[PDB]
Enzyme design. Structure first.
Site, PDB file in Angstrom:
ATOM      1  N   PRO A 300       1.028  -1.445   0.452  1.00  0.00           N
ATOM      2  CA  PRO A 300       0.222  -0.103  -0.121  1.00  0.00           C
ATOM      3  C   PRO A 300       0.970   1.024   0.126  1.00  0.00           C
ATOM      4  O   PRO A 300       1.789   1.722   0.855  1.00  0.00           O
ATOM      5  CB  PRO A 300      -0.596  -0.027   1.559  1.00  0.00           C
ATOM      6  CG  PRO A 300       0.017  -0.856   2.422  1.00  0.00           C
ATOM      7  CD  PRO A 300       0.521  -1.966   1.275  1.00  0.00           C
ATOM      8  N   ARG A 302      -1.318   4.513  -0.736  1.00  0.00           N
ATOM      9  CA  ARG A 302      -2.308   5.636  -0.072  1.00  0.00           C
ATOM     10  C   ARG A 302      -2.904   4.794   0.896  1.00  0.00           C
ATOM     11  O   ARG A 302      -3.312   5.861   1.576  1.00  0.00           O
ATOM     12  CB  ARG A 302      -3.042   5.143  -1.312  1.00  0.00           C
ATOM     13  CG  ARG A 302      -4.439   6.007  -1.300  1.00  0.00           C
ATOM     14  CD  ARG A 302      -5.270   5.229  -2.869  1.00  0.00           C
ATOM     15  NE  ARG A 302      -5.203   6.185  -4.054  1.00  0.00           N
ATOM     16  CZ  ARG A 302      -4.550   5.403  -4.893  1.00  0.00           C
ATOM     17  NH1 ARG A 302      -3.848   4.209  -5.232  1.00  0.00           N
ATOM     18  NH2 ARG A 302      -4.209   6.622  -5.962  1.00  0.00           N
ATOM     19  N   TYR A 347      -6.446  12.439 -13.201  1.00  0.00           N
ATOM     20  CA  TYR A 347      -7.049  10.754 -12.537  1.00  0.00           C
ATOM     21  C   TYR A 347      -9.152  10.787 -13.380  1.00  0.00           C
ATOM     22  O   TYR A 347      -9.426   9.740 -12.203  1.00  0.00           O
ATOM     23  CB  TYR A 347      -6.951  10.229 -11.915  1.00  0.00           C
ATOM     24  CG  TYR A 347      -5.383   9.538 -11.345  1.00  0.00           C
ATOM     25  CD1 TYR A 347      -5.041  11.128 -10.659  1.00  0.00           C
ATOM     26  CD2 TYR A 347      -5.199   9.237 -12.407  1.00  0.00           C
ATOM     27  CE1 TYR A 347      -2.898  10.223 -10.902  1.00  0.00           C
ATOM     28  CE2 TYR A 347      -3.846   8.898 -12.534  1.00  0.00           C
ATOM     29  CZ  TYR A 347      -2.651   9.735 -11.359  1.00  0.00           C
ATOM     30  OH  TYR A 347      -1.407   9.292 -11.626  1.00  0.00           O
ATOM     31  N   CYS A 374      -3.837  29.417 -14.632  1.00  0.00           N
ATOM     32  CA  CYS A 374      -4.489  29.410 -16.205  1.00  0.00           C
ATOM     33  C   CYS A 374      -5.219  29.196 -17.015  1.00  0.00           C
ATOM     34  O   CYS A 374      -4.554  28.487 -18.245  1.00  0.00           O
ATOM     35  CB  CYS A 374      -3.775  30.932 -16.940  1.00  0.00           C
ATOM     36  SG  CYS A 374      -3.508  31.887 -16.032  1.00  0.00           S
ATOM     37  N   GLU A 375      -6.006  27.918 -17.036  1.00  0.00           N
ATOM     38  CA  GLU A 375      -6.169  26.722 -17.423  1.00  0.00           C
ATOM     39  C   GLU A 375      -7.184  26.353 -16.466  1.00  0.00           C
ATOM     40  O   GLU A 375      -7.915  25.949 -15.538  1.00  0.00           O
ATOM     41  CB  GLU A 375      -4.701  25.530 -16.893  1.00  0.00           C
ATOM     42  CG  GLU A 375      -4.468  25.346 -18.323  1.00  0.00           C
ATOM     43  CD  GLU A 375      -4.219  23.526 -18.268  1.00  0.00           C
ATOM     44  OE1 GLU A 375      -2.881  22.910 -17.976  1.00  0.00           O
ATOM     45  OE2 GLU A 375      -4.877  22.598 -17.881  1.00  0.00           O
ATOM     46  N   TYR A 404      -0.261  11.050  -3.453  1.00  0.00           N
ATOM     47  CA  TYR A 404      -0.399  10.962  -4.653  1.00  0.00           C
ATOM     48  C   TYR A 404      -0.803  12.354  -4.950  1.00  0.00           C
ATOM     49  O   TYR A 404      -0.389  12.732  -6.429  1.00  0.00           O
ATOM     50  CB  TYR A 404      -1.142  10.195  -5.552  1.00  0.00           C
ATOM     51  CG  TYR A 404      -0.176   8.803  -5.715  1.00  0.00           C
ATOM     52  CD1 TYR A 404       0.441   8.671  -5.781  1.00  0.00           C
ATOM     53  CD2 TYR A 404      -1.354   8.041  -5.243  1.00  0.00           C
ATOM     54  CE1 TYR A 404       1.241   6.814  -5.352  1.00  0.00           C
ATOM     55  CE2 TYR A 404      -0.770   6.524  -4.633  1.00  0.00           C
ATOM     56  CZ  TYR A 404       0.617   6.402  -5.008  1.00  0.00           C
ATOM     57  OH  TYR A 404       0.396   5.241  -5.268  1.00  0.00           O
TER      58      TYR A 404
END
Lengths: 446, 444
Positions: A300, A302, A347, A374-375, A404
């Protein structure tokens, strides 16, 4: 009233509310933490993290059977925690090993992973004495054998399988032909050839098999079929090499993907239950092909980092955006962005976000949490609810950024890495500095 | 076969050796790798400058072309933009910081973002930046208060949602655009902001801004976005007289100017596209009794981008079964989503080529793949590779100068690649590769 709930399965284990309503972990108001260390801010409930290590190790029967997957999050602090709790450490690149070692992580307890190990990365690994390497190609094998011979040793080793299973959440997929970069296909014979090659060498010892089948896995059903397939390879191996030789293949490592709760709806089983089913299938399956049950390992990331840490932001803009003739979405823009949680963009991950600096009586309003780049796709929490009087200056927190997020961070638009802080019993301690324009500029030349 | 290096895709000064090694600006790529390492970013500097020049010409002036620093930024590049006469759009506290450390003229900086801090805005008027493109009612208050405190009258554009999203040869129109930037024209939030800016003593309205897409290959989206933007202008004459609405002298249609990632990508030559664009700003303007305003455009990708290449060393080749009867050739490489995340993140498509030698082997279907412990770490999803491809070989991916390095990460503790510029015969390190010392540098 409704957004005041802090679901105990999502948010860290030592999180509590003030008498003034402010949210605290390990007894520290988040406001104090923000005013002391800045925002954005990563906040690690140290006790939680250890808590997970103990719990998982207990479930599988020893910390030797639980390798933390450094890819989730790594720095010398965390390495040291993992050492202390008695777990192993899976490292992925040259550099993950470097920092493991810099923090004196006991090499015997490291396992090295990767689809494209270099000769330098492999050489460095045997010098340090890492003890397990999980091999992934036939080329890696020719390469590691040379290297371990050159250095006087026999490198214990597992081979990584592709077993045709992909599991997420309450389902899985089975394929004839898994199409991905890792592993050696069992169905194709590639895995068997790999087993043969390692048995044949002078300088490697085959010691186990490794499978990894996905992430956020909430049922055993996928592992069960995987283990079936994996132990079926072992059967092929009694076939050629006899039962006595194949017992040396003593470790079946079933990979990572142990699940957590990002949203309160998420319902991963408690880890002891899962592990006991897992243990039992490794056993049923093991003996109904004539073998001693080999030892179960699990990797593991996460499920260990992750729940215990929180990203802490300050609201800066609130814009009310028309999405139909009649309806609105309340865009709350924040201190950071995809620079520090790119998981939502990358994701399609789903997070819980909460006002944390006070308690509001205002009715909940549909919203998007959104960062500062800026997206248009710079979005941290795609769909939530948020109290209708949310307002610049407020502190909000997102609930499982331990895993992550920081590892994936960038300096998009020259936004520097957030600081990271650990908290234990009442005390807070900076672990990881925050970047500055000097870091931003530090790779420039004359 | 795989031997053609499509001139619309690869940098302009790209070439083959007598021995068949690929070269740019006269330098063989093998040499670059052997000098500077892999993975490596390689900027054809003349290309960059060429595109600066070509865009400037097409839109009448470098002043009407603002480079979008989001696509790639460092002092060196800031310095190229200055030297070619263009402006610089910066996005955050940090992007201005470096533009300033590189002594970029502030008159020629425009400042963007959905969530500017008090402190970001303060820094920028103190530096004399000159244009700010406001995005929220909140931001307008903050900026009035701040420019007032400084004793200046800060020029300003407002940003509009106009319900257009363009990509490639198409576009979507939307009754209600549902995203973080801009103020809606249709709800009249835009018009509310034009009022409040006309009202303050310390701001001064000079234009309007819409950004509508990326990788845009037709004029059509821009036509409609322009129609709709200039529509606001008409609304303001309605309220304020045509003689104070002509002060709004600048229509900025944002970025999204397209390049060729793949050979079949077919963006129009910029000179054509801008001619077309200029006409319609004109038509649409006189169509509502107004002086043609000046067309400004804010490309990142179309400038940076095609001139930069990422050089990788092959490490592993693996044939992978995908059907009873077929195979996909997984070639793994020095880097990964740490230096090129666009493939995983946007589903981008890239060209990749064998570059260290020339192969007579037939082409085979392939996946170029990074070295990170994640199976989605894919640099190029579907390419072709020569069947004798083999570890040691050097490949390059073809248009990585935009958004690749700015998005880089230290995933699995992989340091940033070095970046190197090559200009007539001559290489030069610009950005240096990260080391474990860097990786550890924030620890306490």
């Amino acid at each position: 009233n409704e957004l005041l709930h802090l679901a105990p399965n999502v948010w860290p284990r030592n999180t509590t509310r003030d008498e003034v309503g402010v949210v605290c972990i390990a007894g520290i108001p988040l406001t104090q933490l923000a005013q002391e260390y800045g925002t954005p801010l990563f906040v690690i409930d140290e006790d939680d993290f250890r808590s997970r290590c103990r719990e998982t190790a207990a479930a599988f029967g020893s910390g030797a059977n639980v390798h933390y997957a450094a890819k989730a999050f790594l720095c010398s602090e965390v390495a040291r925690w993992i050492s202390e709790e008695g777990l192993c450490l899976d490292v992925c690149t040259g550099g993950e090993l470097a920092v493991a070692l810099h923090a004196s992580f006991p090499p015997e307890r490291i396992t090295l992973h990767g689809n494209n190990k270099s000769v330098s990365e492999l050489t460095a690994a045997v010098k340090a004495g890492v003890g397990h390497i999980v091999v992934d190609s036939m080329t890696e094998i020719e390469r590691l054998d040379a290297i371990a011979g050159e250095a006087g040793i026999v490198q214990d080793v597992l081979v990584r399988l592709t077993v045709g299973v992909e599991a997420h959440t309450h389902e899985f997929i089975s394929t004839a032909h898994e199409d991905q970069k890792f592993g050696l296909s069992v169905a194709s014979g590639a895995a068997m050839a790999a087993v043969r090659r390692v048995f044949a060498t002078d300088h490697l010892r085959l010691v186990g098999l490794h499978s990894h089948i996905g992430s956020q896995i909430f049922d055993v059903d996928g592992f069960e079929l995987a283990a079936h397939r994996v132990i079926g390879l072992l059967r092929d191996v009694v076939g050629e090499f006899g039962p006595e030789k194949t017992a040396q293949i003593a470790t079946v490592d079933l990979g990572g993907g142990l699940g957590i709760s990002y949203l309160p709806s998420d319902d991963p089983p408690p880890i002891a239950e899962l592990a006991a089913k897992l243990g039992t299938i490794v056993s049923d399956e093991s003996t109904a092909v004539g073998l001693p049950t080999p030892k179960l390992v699990v990797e593991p990331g996460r499920a260990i980092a992750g729940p215990g840490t929180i990203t802490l932001y300050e609201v800066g803009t609130v814009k009310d955006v028309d999405v139909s003739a009649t309806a609105h979405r309340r865009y709350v823009s924040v201190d950071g962005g995809m620079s520090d949680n790119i998981r939502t963009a990358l994701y399609g991950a789903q997070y819980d976000v909460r006002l944390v600096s006070r308690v509001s009586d205002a009715p909940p309003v549909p919203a998007r949490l959104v960062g500062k780049h800026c997206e248009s796709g710079d979005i941290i929490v795609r769909d939530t609810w948020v109290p209708d009087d949310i307002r610049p200056g407020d502190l909000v927190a997102v609930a499982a950024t331990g895993a992550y997020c920081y590892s994936l961070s960038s300096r998009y638009n020259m936004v520097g890495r957030p600081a990271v802080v650990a908290v234990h019993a009442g005390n807070a301690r900076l672990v990881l500095r925050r970047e500055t324009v000097d870091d931003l500029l530090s790779l420039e030349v004359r």
